[PDB]
Structure 1
Amino acid sequence: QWALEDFEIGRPLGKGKFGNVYLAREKQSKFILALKVLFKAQLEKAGVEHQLRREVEIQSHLRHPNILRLYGYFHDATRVYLILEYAPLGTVYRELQKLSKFDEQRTATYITELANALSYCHSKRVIHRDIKPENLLLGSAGELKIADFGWSVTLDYLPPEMIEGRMHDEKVDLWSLGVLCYEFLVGKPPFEANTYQETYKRISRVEFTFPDFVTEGARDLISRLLKHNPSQRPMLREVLEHPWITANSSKPSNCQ
């Protein structure tokens, strides 16, 4: 039974489309965490209010070192409050901008961490959508934390494009791992182009190239993940066992 009065609210940590995050200390436990304030109006304006309610619900049952922890949540007339884990090292995206690009060990380790977390959710019948660097936070020990809340558990007149979206949902994160792996090593997304339109075509036609410095092991893994056909994409287990990942990762791969 939470209330804003239960916290000592400190400095802002970021502003988003739907809300703001602040650093906070729980008066009771003198425990440092992050308070996310979401504006119901913004959520409704985008028709995601009902969606979030369900995602937060799923999250409250997820417990994993590489998934940003949701300690609880509450609300009032116009706000939704999320009591979240405080990740002191910022986002992966920020870190990547700071270093330009990651080496193989850093990259492989992050990929393993994501795969381990996704693998765990899979075993709880929970699926994840696309993953962006902007939604990955870093813990004090440098561990990555999935922090978006993209979780989830007629047809006759719909065309492939509108249908293929709602099917093979369990293969979307695999494509994302491939994109993240490429960006971590190269410094830019593989389908980044000049225009909104150009980017579409690149992704759709699955056309991209590897800079010379990208080793063979990494090209193999990325190429297997970035396949147009979702069923052609490997299983999370295959990622966790890929020679390049196990060789370079410093974090033990733990499937399921």
Structure 2
Amino acid sequence: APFVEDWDLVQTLGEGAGEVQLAVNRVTEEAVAVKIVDMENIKKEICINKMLNHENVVKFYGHRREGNIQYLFLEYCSGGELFDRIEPDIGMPEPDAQRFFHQLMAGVVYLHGIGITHRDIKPENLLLDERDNLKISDFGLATVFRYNNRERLLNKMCGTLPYVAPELLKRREFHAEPVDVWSCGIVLTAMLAGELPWDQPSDSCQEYSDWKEKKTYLNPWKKIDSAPLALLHKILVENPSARITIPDIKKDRWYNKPLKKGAKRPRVTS
């Protein structure tokens, strides 16, 4: 079928690093996101993307290299970033945050299960499809932490300071999985309070010391109900060996609290 390999670049979706363009197929009008990288780091990113196949992870369709430029064909998530669903200083309704948190855990369980750590979990990187299904995106900082059933400890400093686990700032080496668990807890905090608790998790940071001293009568914690706050108390634990694991997050009371009705379906009366 002629022209089916042709895609029109119609809208800029993101910048930094190059750019992410919305691509529309000339024939079928299928929409995909094309990541344009001018163009070792991209080689690893493509290699990790080729491993991925889960409903809460951005789909990787393939890649093409046009000399110095790499084109990554990825899922278009029309709902945009989770970030834009967070109202500043407010957050979002607690049932919406719980549903997004369940979908985030499903994606993180999948990635950890195949031995991949994302390392930069934040609302700017959590995309939403047409049905507001969350998808983990951007595997540019991702790495393999388990291979041939052997865990490799990490030592590379990366991520985004307000979302990073304190062990990345205090220890030479650390386990990969509790780092992603921590960043998910900060995403949950942002979703429920519309604000980030600290600039970074260090003792020099007053808001971080207040949290460790259980001053939950202060913001952002005062805006969060006792059931989700009890989960945050288990996630945002400084010692990564004492921090709750995802299998235990799945047993948490709030995590299992019925709160959100399914999507509004067409109905009539009489």
TM-score class, shorter-chain normalisation, is 0.7 to 0.9
- In structure 2, give the amino acid aligned to 1:188: E
1:106 pairs with one of 71, 96, 99 = 96
- Residues 206 and 226 of structure 1 are in contact (CA less than 8 Å); yes or no, is this contact kept in structure 2? no
Contact 2:89 2:193 in 1 (8 A): no
Q: Verify the 8 A CA contact 2:198 2:207 in the aligned structure 1.
A: no
Task: Assess if the C-alpha contact under 8 Å between 2:60 and 2:74 holds in 1.
Answer: yes
1:153-208: CA deviation from partner (whole Å, max 9, x where unpaired): 1xxxxxx977835421121111011111111100001114xxx8x97833995543
Listed as ranges, the gaps of 5+ residues in structure 2 are 145-166, 263-270
TM-score (norm 2): 0.75
Q: Equivalent residue for 2:160?
A: none
Unaligned runs of 5+ in 1: 41-49, 154-159
Alignment CA distance shift 1:22-1:96 (3 Å): same
- Give how far 1:14 is off: 2.6
Please say if 1:78 is aligned against 2:88. no
Amino acid at match of 1:32: A
Alignment equivalent of 2:81, drawn from 91, 94, 109: 91
Given the superposition, is the C-alpha separation of residues 205 and 142 from structure 1 closer, same or farther in structure 2, using an over 3 Å criterion? closer
Partners in 2 of 1:168 and 1:203 — Cα distance?
A: 26
Identity of aligned residues (%): 26
> Match for residue 257 of structure 2?
247
Contact 1:130 1:172 in 2 (8 A): no
SS in 1 for 2:254: helix
Out of 49, 53, 57, the residue aligned to residue 59 of structure 1 is: 49
Match of 1:217 in 2: 227
Measure the CA separation in 2 of the matches of 1:135 and 1:84. Answer: 13
Number of positions where the alignment pairs a residue of Structure 1 with one of Structure 2 = 231
Shift of 1:106: 0.9
Write the distance in 1 (CA, Å) between the matches of 2:46 and 2:245.
Answer: 26
Taking the aligned partners of 1:222 and 1:162, their CA distance within structure 2 comes to 20
* 1:151 aligned partner: 142
In the alignment, does 2:239 pair up with 1:229? yes
Output the TM-score relative to the length of structure 1: 0.79
User: Helix, strand or coil: the match of 1:227?
Assistant: coil
Letter of the 2:143 counterpart:
S
Using the alignment, how far apart are the partners of 2:130 and 2:73 within structure 1? Answer: 18
Quick one: which amino acid aligns to residue 186 of structure 2? V
Q: Tell me, in whole angstroms, the C-alpha distance in 2 between the residues paired with 1:232 and 1:191.
A: 21
Q: Which has the higher contact order (CA 8 A, sep 6+)?
A: 1
- The 8 Å contact of residues 68 and 145 in structure 1, kept in 2 or not, is answered as yes
- Which residue of 121, 128, 131 maps to 1:141? 131
Q: Distance in 2 between matches of 1:199 and 1:238?
A: 26
Contact 1:218 1:244 survives alignment (8 Å):
yes
